[PDB]
Amino acid sequence: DEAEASKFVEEYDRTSQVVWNEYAGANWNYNTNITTETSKILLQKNMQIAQHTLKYGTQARKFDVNQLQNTTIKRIIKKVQDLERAALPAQELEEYNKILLDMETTYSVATVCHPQGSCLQLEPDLTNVMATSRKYEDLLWAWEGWRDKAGRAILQFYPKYVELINQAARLNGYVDAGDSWRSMYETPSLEQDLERLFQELQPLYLNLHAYVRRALHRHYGAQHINLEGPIPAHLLGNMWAQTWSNIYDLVVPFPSAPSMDTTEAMLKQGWTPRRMFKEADDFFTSLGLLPVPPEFWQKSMLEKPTDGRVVCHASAWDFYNGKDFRIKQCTTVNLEDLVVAHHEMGHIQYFMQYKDLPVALREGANPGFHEAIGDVLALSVSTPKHLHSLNLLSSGSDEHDINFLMKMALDKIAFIPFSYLVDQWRWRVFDGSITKENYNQEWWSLRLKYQGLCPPVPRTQGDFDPGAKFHIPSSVPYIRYFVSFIIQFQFHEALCQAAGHTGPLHKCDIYQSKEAGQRLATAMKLGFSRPWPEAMQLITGQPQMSASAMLSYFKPLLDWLRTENELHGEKLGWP
Numbered sequence: 034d035e036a037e038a039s040k041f042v043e044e045y046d047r048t049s050q051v052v053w054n055e056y057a058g059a060n061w062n063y064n065t066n067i068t069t070e071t072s073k074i075l076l077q078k079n080m081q082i083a084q085h086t087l088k089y090g091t092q093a094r095k096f097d098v099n100q101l102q103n104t105t106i107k108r109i110i111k112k113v114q115d116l117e118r119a120a121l122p123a124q125e126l127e128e129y130n131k132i133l134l135d136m137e138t139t140y141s142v143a144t145v146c147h148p149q150g151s152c153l154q155l156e157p158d159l160t161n162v163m164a165t166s167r168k169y170e171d172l173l174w175a176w177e178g179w180r181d182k183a184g185r186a187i188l189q190f191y192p193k194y195v196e197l198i199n200q201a202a203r204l205n206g207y208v209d210a211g212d213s214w215r216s217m218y219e220t221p222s223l224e225q226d227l228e229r230l231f232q233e234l235q236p237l238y239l240n241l242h243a244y245v246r247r248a249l250h251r252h253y254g255a256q257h258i259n260l261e262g263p264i265p266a267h268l269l270g271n272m273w274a275q276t277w278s279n280i281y282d283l284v285v286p287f288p289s290a291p292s293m294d295t296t297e298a299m300l301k302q303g304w305t306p307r308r309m310f311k312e313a314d315d316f317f318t319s320l321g322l323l324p325v326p327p328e329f330w331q332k333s334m335l336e337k338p339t340d341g342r343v344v345c346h347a348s349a350w351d352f353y354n355g356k357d358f359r360i361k362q363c364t365t366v367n368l369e370d371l372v373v374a375h376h377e378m379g380h381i382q383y384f385m386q387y388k389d390l391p392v393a394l395r396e397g398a399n400p401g402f403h404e405a406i407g408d409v410l411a412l413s414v415s416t417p418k419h420l421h422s423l424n425l426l427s428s429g430s431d432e433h434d435i436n437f438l439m440k441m442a443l444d445k446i447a448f449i450p451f452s453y454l455v456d457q458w459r460w461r462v463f464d465g466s467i468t469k470e471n472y473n474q475e476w477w478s479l480r481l482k483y484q485g486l487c488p489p490v491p492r493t494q495g496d497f498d499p500g501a502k503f504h505i506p507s508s509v510p511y512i513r514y515f516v517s518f519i520i521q522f523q524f525h526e527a528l529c530q531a532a533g534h535t536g537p538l539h540k541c542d543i544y545q546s547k548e549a550g551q552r553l554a555t556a557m558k559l560g561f562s563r564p565w566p567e568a569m570q571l572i573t574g575q576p577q578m579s580a581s582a583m584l585s586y587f588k589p590l591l592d593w594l595r596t597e598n599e600l601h602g603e604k605l606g607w608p
């Protein structure tokens with residue numbers, strides 16, 4: 034009756050755990066040891082997973098979900114009927130598995146070489162060049178070189194990947210793969226919701242862009258910077274211009290205020306990756322949240338290992354037995370990686386909070402929620418006060434404040450258009466409005482229209498700049514990070530009120546608030562069990578996504594930018 038459904042979900046649950054546990058293992062062993070062997074064993078455990086999905090997913094398809102009374106079991110069964118790639122016929126499944134492997138690998142082993150000099154990798158070499166060099170020509174060398182070797186090299190596999198991920202979405206009942214992705218939020222009004230959210234951030238973003246443009250004009254000179262045109266995409270301190278905080282020192286509002294490079298100070302005081310994660314764990318436990326188990330310290334890879342190996346992109350790992358969780362990060366000892374550690378630590382925290390739900394229901398209330406936990410804590414960590422107490426700053430005034438808000442704005446506000454544009458591009462690739470004759474040009478339309486950037490070198494057929502960003506070859510959806518950046522402010526705003534904080538939201542530090550831990554924990558325990566507005570409502574007292582907490586956090590900076598931009602006559606925007 035209803036009792037065959039009960040028995041099925043029970044059985045899918047027990048067998049999931051085993052097969053997922055074995056595949057997590059092999060997937061780890063390869064990400065920390067790119068070989069042809071580990072390559073194999075994984076392409077192997079991929080088959081086993083696929084066959085477990087096909088068999089439970091076939092059975093789930095046989096139940097009429099209409100007729101189910103139990104809401105939890107309805108929801109599990111509905112989700113298991115989505116086989117994903119396992120829906121592909123054997124040949125294409127094999128081809129698709131090969132393509133993704135080849136895209137990841139290509140991206141991860143790319144190097145940019147000086148002629149008769151030596152060869153730079155993405156992490157940490159090209160990252161450091163992008164972060165610290167202040168020579169137009171050196172930045173251009175790294176920016177173009179990366180697109181030339183990672184970008185172009187992905188172009189050969191993308192149309193084939195597109196057809197396969199589309200085929201699988203069709204055979205699971207969606208129209209294309211972007212439709213499939215959008216459905217993880219169960220929110221039919223999503224595109225307009227995000228559009229509305231994006232439009233509310235424009236005044237802050239335009240104001241920051243104009244102010245930074247003026248600062249680059251001053252450093253790199255009038256012949257290199259059009260004061261009414263887009264910013265050249267290689268001057269923002271980051272490979273993708275997706276965060277700008279590495280150029281903080283070109284744009285300091287109040288340089289007469291005392292300041293310490295945090296990065297400078299961590300190095301002096303002999304901080305290690307271990308310390309960075311220990312600090313993050315301490316922040317989690319200060320709120321009454323879970324510590325990572327002892328196993329996590331034994332088993333994680335928290336630095337690039339030394340013995341000539343690895344996938345360096347930071348990621349968090351659930352191994353699906355509720356005891357083994359891990360992080361794999363090639364940590365640099367800087368502020369940027371300290372934030373990243375917090376980010377990954379929040380994914381770990383979610384894994385532990387939801388470890389007792391059925392597996393099908395082990396996900397964020399929405400993917401945006403999974404992305405926001407670590408970030409919320411890190412907004413507290415980043416406060417001057419908190420950093421003072423870490424012995425990483427000297428630490429008052431209106432001046433110090435604006436400076437601080439400007440550091441934050443170079444991370445949070447600048448990323449808003451970036452994080453928005455990625456899936457706008459991919460959605461259009463998936464639904465077939467953009468073709469391989471068009472990939473790059475349409476990537477540039479979006480970079481220009483949302484971010485107000487231009488390529489420093491004309492692009493030519495043969496370029497595929499999207500493949501130069503990790504999530505594109507690895508096929509990881511990106512809109513999550515846009516949702517994250519909005520909702521992390523809302524959460525931060527709510528946790529500050531729970532914690533008894535008063536006055537300006539950007540002074541809040543929720544370290545050691547047990548009230549704040551409780552809101553988060555009950556939200557995270559829900560997993561993917563309830564529509565996400567219910568978790569929003571638990572954390573924040575209402576159920577909608579809203580820009581107003583972000584706007585209100587940055588409100589002093591927006592007043593400052595307007596006054597400053599107006600003094601100088603800035604024309605906000607670009608043509």
Ligand SMILES: *[C@@H]1O[C@H](CO[C@@H]2O[C@@H](C)[C@@H](O)[C@@H](O)[C@@H]2O)[C@@H](O[C@@H]2O[C@H](CO)[C@@H](O[C@@H]3O[C@H](CO)[C@@H](O)[C@H](O)[C@@H]3O)[C@H](O)[C@H]2NC(C)=O)[C@H](O)[C@H]1NC(C)=O
Pocket residue numbers: 039040042043103104105106389390391
């Ligand atoms: C609809 O069915 C759900 C899910 O049922 C659970 O999974 C099924 C496949 C069956 O195997 C059931 O045996 C199993 O209960 C019901 O949800 C579950 O409700 C119970 C309360 O009976 C929750 O249990 C709690 O568990 C903790 C420790 O784990 C205890 O401290 C609590 O005191 C309590 O016993 C259980 O967590 C919950 N399961 C999930 C995953 O949500 C659900 O109640 C049912 N709806 C109704 C009212 O019919």
Ligand SMILES: C[C@H](N[C@H](C(=O)O)[C@@H]1CCCN1C(=O)c1ccc(C(=O)O)cc1)C(=O)N1CCC[C@H]1C(=O)O
Pocket residue numbers: 346347348349350351373376377380396397403404509514
């Ligand atoms: C470095 C951060 N890395 C990602 C990430 O952590 O999101 C990595 C790679 C892809 C996802 N990821 C996870 O570790 C992760 C693991 C599991 C889950 C889940 O189980 O639900 C979700 C994510 C990132 O890319 N970021 C972080 C912020 C901005 C974005 C970027 O750098 O472009």
Ligand SMILES: [Cl-]
Pocket residue numbers: 273498499501
């Ligand atoms: Cl680009």
Ligand SMILES: [Cl-]
Pocket residue numbers: 214217400401510511512513
């Ligand atoms: Cl997403």
Ligand SMILES: [Zn+2]
Pocket residue numbers: 376377380403404
């Ligand atoms: Zn993440």
